[PDB]
Amino acid sequence: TNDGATILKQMQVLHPAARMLVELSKAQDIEAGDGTTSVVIIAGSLLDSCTKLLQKGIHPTIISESFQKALEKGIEILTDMSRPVELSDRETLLNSATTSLNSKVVSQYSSLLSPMSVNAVMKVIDPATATSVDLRDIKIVKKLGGTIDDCELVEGLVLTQKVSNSGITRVEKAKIGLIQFCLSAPKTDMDNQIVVSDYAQMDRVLREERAYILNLVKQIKKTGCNVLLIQKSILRDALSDLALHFLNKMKIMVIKDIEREDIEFICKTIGTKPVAHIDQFTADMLGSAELAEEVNLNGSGKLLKITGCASPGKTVTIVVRGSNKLVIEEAERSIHDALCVIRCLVKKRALIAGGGAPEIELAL
Amino acid sequence: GVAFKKTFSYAGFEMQPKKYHNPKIALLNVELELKAEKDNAEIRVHTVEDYQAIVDAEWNILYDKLEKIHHSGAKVVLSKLPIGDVATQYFADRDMFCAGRVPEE
Amino acid sequence: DGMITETKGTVLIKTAEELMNFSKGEENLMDAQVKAIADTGANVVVTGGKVADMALHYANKYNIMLVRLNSKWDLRRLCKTVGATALPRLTPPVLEEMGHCDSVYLSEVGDTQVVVFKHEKEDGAISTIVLRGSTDNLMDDIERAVD
Amino acid sequence: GHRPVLVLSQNTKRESGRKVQSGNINAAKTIADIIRTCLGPKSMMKMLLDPMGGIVMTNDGNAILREIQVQHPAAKSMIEISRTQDEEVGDGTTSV
Amino acid sequence: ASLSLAPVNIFKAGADEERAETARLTSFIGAIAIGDLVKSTLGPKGMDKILLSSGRDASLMVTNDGATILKNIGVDNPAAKVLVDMSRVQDDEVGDGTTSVTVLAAELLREAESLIAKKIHPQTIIAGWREATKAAREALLSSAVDHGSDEVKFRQDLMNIAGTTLSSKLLTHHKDHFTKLAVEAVLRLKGSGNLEAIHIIKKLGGSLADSYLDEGFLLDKKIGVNQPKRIENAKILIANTGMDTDKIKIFGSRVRVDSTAKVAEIEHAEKEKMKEKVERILKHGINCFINRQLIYNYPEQLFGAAGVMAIEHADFAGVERLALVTGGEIASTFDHPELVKLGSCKLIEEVMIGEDKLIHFSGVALGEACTIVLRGATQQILDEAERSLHDALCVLAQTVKDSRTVYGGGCSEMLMAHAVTQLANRTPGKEAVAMESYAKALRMLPTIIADNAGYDSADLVAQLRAAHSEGNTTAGLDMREGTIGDMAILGITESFQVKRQVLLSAAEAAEVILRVDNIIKAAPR
Amino acid sequence: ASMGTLAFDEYGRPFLIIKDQDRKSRLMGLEALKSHIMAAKAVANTMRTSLGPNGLDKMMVDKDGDVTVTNDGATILSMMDVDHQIAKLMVELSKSQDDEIGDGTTGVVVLAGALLEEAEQLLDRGIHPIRIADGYEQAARVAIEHLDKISDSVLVDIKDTEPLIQTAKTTLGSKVVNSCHRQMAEIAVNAVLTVADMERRDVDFELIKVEGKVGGRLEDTKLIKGVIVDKDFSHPQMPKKVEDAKIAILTCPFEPPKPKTKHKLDVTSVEDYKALQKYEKEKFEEMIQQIKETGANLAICQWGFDDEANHLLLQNNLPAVRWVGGPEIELIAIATGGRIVPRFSELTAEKLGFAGLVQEISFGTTKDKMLVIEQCKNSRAVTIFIRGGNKMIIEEAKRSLHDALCVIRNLIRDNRVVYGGGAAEISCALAVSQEADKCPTLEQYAMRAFADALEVIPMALSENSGMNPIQTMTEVRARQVKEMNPALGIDCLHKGTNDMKQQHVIETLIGKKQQISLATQMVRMILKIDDIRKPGESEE
Amino acid sequence: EGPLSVFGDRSTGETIRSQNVMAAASIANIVKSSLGPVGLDKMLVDDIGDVTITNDGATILKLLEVEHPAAKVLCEL
Ligand SMILES: Nc1ncnc2c1ncn2[C@@H]1O[C@H](COP(=O)(O)OP(=O)(O)O)[C@@H](O)[C@H]1O
Ligand SMILES: Nc1ncnc2c1ncn2[C@@H]1O[C@H](COP(=O)(O)OP(=O)(O)O)[C@@H](O)[C@H]1O
Ligand SMILES: [Mg+2]
Ligand SMILES: [Mg+2]
Ligand SMILES: [Mg+2]
Ligand SMILES: [Mg+2]
16 A cells, blocks of 8 residues: 555554554544645654754743744645635646546556546535535445456446346346335234144145235335345345245346445435335335346456436445455555545635645745 | 341331230241242233233232231241242231241251 | 142143132142041151142141151161052052051150151061161171171 | 471381291292202203393203392392302202 | 561461551652652643553553543552542542642642651641641632622633633643633533533544534434435424334233234234324424434334434433433323424534534524534544543533632642641641641642743742732732732632642541551452 | 371381371460460550551551551451461451440450460469469459449430530541541431430441442531432433422332233234233323322332333423332331332322422532432431542541441440540459459469550550550559549540540440450450461462 | 571470380380290391391391481480
8 A cells, every 4th residue: 555544554553652643644534535644754754853952952832832833824825825726627626636646556547547536526516515525425346357447437336236036137227126124924023923723724824925925026016116125134034035936027136135334325326215114115216227237247246237327316336446456455545545635625625736846835 | 935137138127116015926938929820830811901910810819818917917927938028018018027038947 | 749740731821810719729639638638547648759838738737747758768668667558649548558557756866866667566577776886887897797 | 398207217118927928938939930940850941131141041050040130038048048059069059 | 566577477378568667658659659640740831641551452542631640550559549549539529630639649748758757646747737727728718709790700700710721731722712612611501510411522633723612513323314314493302212123011922823914914013003103203293303212214214204304323312412402302102292392493404524424403492512523633632632621611610500719820829828837837836847748738739830831930939928928819820921920810710619629638638648557468369 | 396296106107197187287285375375466466556546547458459548446357368367366356346336346456465465474474374264254354343333324315415426426536537526426426316216225227328429528428317319310301309209119110010920912913912002001101190199299119110101200290210229218218208119009198208308419520410318207217428538538437437326326225334545444454453452362463464454455545645655554543543533544635634534535334344355255265275277288 | 487486397295205205116116026035037128139137136226227316316225
């Protein structure tokens, strides 16, 4: 890695001053997202000068107040050098992203990564009347294999879950439905048992289980849904074999084990509204999509993509590819740095030159 | 006569009088507590009325034992088996003395 | 004590009345059994197993002496020396199965409490030799000489 | 601390009574049995392995007795009388 | 003879004892070590300490609070344990004065050691100290000034007290801003003393001057999937119900049927019960619903279809603070909508603080509950800022409860020492020497305060003593330049409760430690 | 001098008698007596410094490093980690004195040590220890008779408590809580007198609750004629103060009923589910209504309750407290005059307790809340609330208050008093000395040793206060002989006079009698032991 | 060990007196079986196999290893 915060926090430093510098880098990453190495080097240089200042016979309280005065003057100077910028100017955004990526391993792929990052940031925010960017609306998916040139900016969502309904893939004009209940045998929250004292009852148990499952599947189908996403269930079986067979026979794509944490992202992207009881499962709570297909990554894995959504949300997904895992992690960190740079350009829209110019002007 | 140490009185014991001038003593081997009727007893009901009736029946069993003890005319009650807080408070309300887990000897 | 089922016994209560009456009925049954035993003229009961609290209560009420012999050998020898038959149920003993003895009492010899089944006649199936002594080893040697 | 107090020194054994007599007589009998079969014109020879690596293949009783080592002092007395008989008259060491 | 120095040994292995001289030596050494450690972090020009934990996590803590310094140290000297517990109890009673009381106790025990070396029985020292403590307490009580009747003067006193409390801590850089923040936060409590109604949220990043007191309230919880993210003229209902696989509390109940159709019917009945409960909740006519416990998916979508915000898992403190700030009632039954009061606020929205999202309540009705966002450059800075703000809030709450105030900057200590000296000048015996030592410690407190700033402490203390003897009862240390000045004009004030507690606790601990003449240790486990 | 015997037979065969005899130890006769006397002397000399108003405290550290500063002799010896058997005997003697009397736990140890110290010289002169024990016993009998002779009676009447106040002050003089001397003594006297059966019967200590909370000041310790509760109101929005509260003490959790016997309620249809839900809701409403119908204002429960009951109680203007302990429930019922009710069906108006004021109390910046139930009508239970600057002085104040309560209880049991400060010891020593002259020669030495041992308490009191022991004790004894006044002691406080009757230094007669009796019995028991057989294994 | 503070063991009274008698009796019991015309000789092994068959009392006690001082008195006697 080249990220200063990652380098600092990855190695244990064992010294209180070093740990406070690590916390400083973390705070700079939180507020800014880049410049995490510059701030640490600045702090180190300031303390190095403090060595001679203290040795000269100056109390370490005059030094602090003088440093505060110098900081205020430097803030004034930096603001003086600043140039107003508006988000409508794409060239400045691209230049900022390229400058952010210049120092990373993806400097060669910058010509593809920087416009991708700028587009990703602009997709999830309103260009006007915006004061902050929530980077959690941009999902980064790391898939091993291929080239960093194969990084993609899918505007739908990418699900790493496999399709249980093997044999049906790439359904068009998808009507996606997200259910939070289980398609299995009936079960009440309070403990329940079924007592059998006659063979007729014992056959009727299976008959009524089949009837109940078939009724559930038919009510799901009647809404016109053809893609079903099932939330992960621990206590009760989310998807039984009979339910999967019935769904397959009625031409419906089934995708199970959807994490509870991704419900908000999926609903924001597709536009579906979660369903927890079959009574409320109606057509209006379905997300319409142009295409929902599963694609193989040249034998390196399988991804599900849902590209093209009526009334799309303010979310994007970035798929990162690489030869090995280390360059993939570094590419993810560099893309995050670029997104953070664009975010810092969103709030306090001011721009300065780099290359050591503002800091040498500060020194003078 | 006989003397022995006080044996782990429950709550409500301090309202029982501690001196009697001609008491009748009810020596018992009985557990005066709310508890399962037997270790292998199972109650099967299918109505809330039956649930309430079962609870009231447990309470009535305990109170019937206590009322028989009280109507025996005794004022001091001693038991080898533990005497619960409910029985202790019941006997305190009747100005009676109780003591559970008294040693067999 | 009142006998129990051999497979598994659970008290299935379905109404409040059964719950209230169960313990009273069980106690009445035990009292009836003990009184039926006592009505045969028996005044000493020897059992090979544990003694229930209610059974002990109702035996004390009817002035019946209780002896609990753990070892089956002692029970068999007592049956030989008294002339009784070891009944497998709590049914009152018939005339022939009832044992007889001249005197049964609780006595202390030295510092050990003993239960003595004593015949006044100079006969019987089993006779015992009570060995005294100042040492356990001495009594063991005397027992070897007796053998 | 407090090392034990003893009248005689440590590792000082003592046997007495009928056992000592029985042991002495048994040791003498075993010493006799060692060379019992080396008497007479039909005697068989014995092979003795010296601790120095030599081999003493002999029929003489005194040589056999002097070439072995024993721990029971009665056996030592028997070896001594065998040597005395050998030194005094020259033969009869097995017979004695 | 003695147990240790006897031909026969009376102890088990590892258990020893220390007689008079040895016990006094160990106790005095421990007390002096504790006092020396806690001092140098005293007064406006006191430095901080680094508490590097030796544990597995190796927690790092940069602090100026004396109570926290004494809390997280491995102490084996029993007298040091006494002093540590004194500091902890002082912190529990009032927010400030931990370092002051610890240093005062240490100086008192040093004077006691000197007196013992001068062949004075400890009981005489204790009696003299009791008399001196009585005199000093009377003088301090007579010196108190009350300004609670006047609103503007009381507000000025609150600002002065907050500034004086925050002068020593790391927040002295932005003392003005932080003093205004703390005073406003305390005044918003409307006389209530529960500091739990004031929530301090530490968000990493940003300058220490970026900290602010929110005009409404802030919550760190989430919202349901299909629920509005922004409502206007909110009608809030705060609840403590389950709404998560809600079971009838008959624990022995069970479903016992002979067909799966009946099981499906019972499941539908359970869902219908949950829907009916949600409908009863909605009958209150609400816009935002806050539940202390979890909210499952079915009630979540039921609220979403009704367009009602459903904030879940707001803990006991969360619901209490929301009730305080909005005026709602924490309800667990919904059969009487007219018996339940609904909290009201002008706006509910989601704000973006740092890299995290929080729920913002704006235009609250009551507002008797505050949230303070602390922005810092390091985690240690945030923790120390929170501790300093807690100290300031505690002192301000104590001043609100009891409005009597005394002047700081060593003025109170000098007045106490003057009264003690006046009492000692008319007393025969060595108790006069004991009271003189008491006064010496009381004067040593501002002496250390001046030493921490590097000034000529001896000269300043002599000037202060002369001024107090002449009649100038408000003279105190001026640390802007390093001279003496009028504490009334310069606006350095302290709570009377804090100074009284410091004096009394220090005297009590010195008395209890001095009475000990033998330390007996059992065999360690 | 140890290891028992070691001969290994005169025939050289092994001679093993006792298991592991080569690792055991034993002492016989005068050596064992001297070792016992030395150990007892060491213990008594350690303890004697904590005697009197000028006595000093001992800082005790346990296994876990916890520290207790105390002057109580019984506590000091209990926490002291001894191995010697005679030291354990001293510890047990002090514990016995604490149990029977409650005060004088330090005087007994010093007296026993002095008695054994004199017995050492007596044995060296060549006297059988049984003779010494018999002489000690008869000298103790004479001393007890003299104590009965010189005793004085006091009034234990409620209207005038001044003698009780003086006795409690004398008890508390040696403790650290003497800074609030009269206040602490008066609250102890009021506590004992409030919870007491009048006709010289027992004073039951379960009716006195002693609680200590850090913070505040030691002067803030006060007597609460009610109950202090560590709990608070269940709902945070419940009112913090109830006036003229009509308490409702219950031991039933505010939950749907649950049979104790194993049970199962079968739900077989939707109607069953609806009936069960309605049953639960109606049970909650019914229990709340049953509580409200009696007119109660406050409800006290022992086993806690759930959210629906909590909100129903809040909605119906019924403040409530949950999870109250059983002893606290009993104390509340006793003080408020109410009855403990096991279920709502049995709750009536006549079973409600009445309290003048129920309040929730804060303790500064601690979040810790506690409940006060005071202003009862005729409260038969009392509570003492102790404050302080640290937990250590709080514990010391707790044990000092226990000492004061025990002394007032002894005064209730027997109202005869003797004047302390060593005056009683000096008078007893003088009586023993006069008795010794008439006695035959052989027991004279034992009686004189007993008198000299009795003279150690004035010596310790004078030495602890800085005065010269022998000169002061001799002068006081000469004054007592010159003018018949058994009230002359050691002026430890330097008040100017030696008359302890004027100085109001008062002690219970039964306390002194128990001191002398227990010391004599333990000294005899030690003197009768002439053999030790320790394992001597030095095990870990 | 105690107040004496001597780096060694001590025995007093009947304890030491019995040991001296026991030690003296041990020496006698060694040679009691070698008295009178019906006495029997003794065999002594010198830890290296040296055998000494003797009946003289002095010779037996010369070769014996004695530790107790009281026994040494009789052996030298
Ligand atoms: N501006 C100031 N000028 C003079 N003295 C001050 C000032 N601020 C604080 N002090 C003094 O510093 C002392 C210590 O305060 P501080 O270190 O903040 O907390 P603590 O009382 O816990 O040590 C106080 O007694 C106060 O009198
Ligand atoms: N004011 C006093 N003047 C003289 N002697 C006192 C005074 N108060 C207590 N004493 C003496 O101090 C002795 C020790 O009392 P104390 O330490 O309170 O309990 P203990 O007897 O357990 O040591 C008592 O025997 C008493 O006679
Ligand atoms: Mg960068
Ligand atoms: Mg030949
Ligand atoms: Mg402060
Ligand atoms: Mg006392």
